[PDB]
Amino acid sequence: FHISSQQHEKAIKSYFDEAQTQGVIIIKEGKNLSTYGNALARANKEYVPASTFKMLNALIGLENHKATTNEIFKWDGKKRTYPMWEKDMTLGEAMALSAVPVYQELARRTGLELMQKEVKRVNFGNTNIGTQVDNFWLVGPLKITPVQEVNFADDLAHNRLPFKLETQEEVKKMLLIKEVNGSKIYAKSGWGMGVTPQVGWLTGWVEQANGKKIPFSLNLEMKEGMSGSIRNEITYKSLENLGII
């Protein structure tokens, strides 16, 4: 509270500087958006959502009865990119493992026509899914800005998306990634590997002990031989530096 704004800005900038990348973290407090990091002009640029799209894919599939939260999506027995994905799992387990095949199956069940209408109805990013129902969030044409991502998180955190309360609660349940002091962090990571440069995301919110929710979206460039966990590490250091956790 005695810490100056200049010092907070310099500290958060230094976390991106030390990771040797370029990025931002946008923090929302009520209606006010604060942009931190070492590349502030990223805030209104469009990037593929990559696996952050699982949040919406889940809302859509549950709302439209394409799956339930208890349903087991069977592994087809084919080799996957990660061994951890070679198993049968729920949507919730697949969210935590970020198992793309499960979410591609969900997207196929939803189908292109319904997916396009639902993405349009929620006004997510540029709202364009093109003609390929199973990869539109990974390689384009769907794009979204870091400001749009944090505003999406804010909407979900406060149950303002146009889905049933229950549907929003089911998906939020799936997004708990960390508890620190009395605070819970709900978020989804994203890593656009099929585009150049690659984009890294961690979008979510903090629920504080008192019940206040502070949405955030980290957005940065993922570089060759960078670990996925740098997204989490920069996020947790930034939130701690600002006294949010």
Ligand SMILES: *C(=O)N1C[C@H](NOS(=O)(=O)O)C=C(C)[C@H]1C(N)=O
């Ligand atoms: C999502 O953006 N994914 C699926 C998987 N997990 O991504 S995550 O690290 O953001 O949670 C791995 C990917 C590289 C990526 C993808 N494009 O398939």
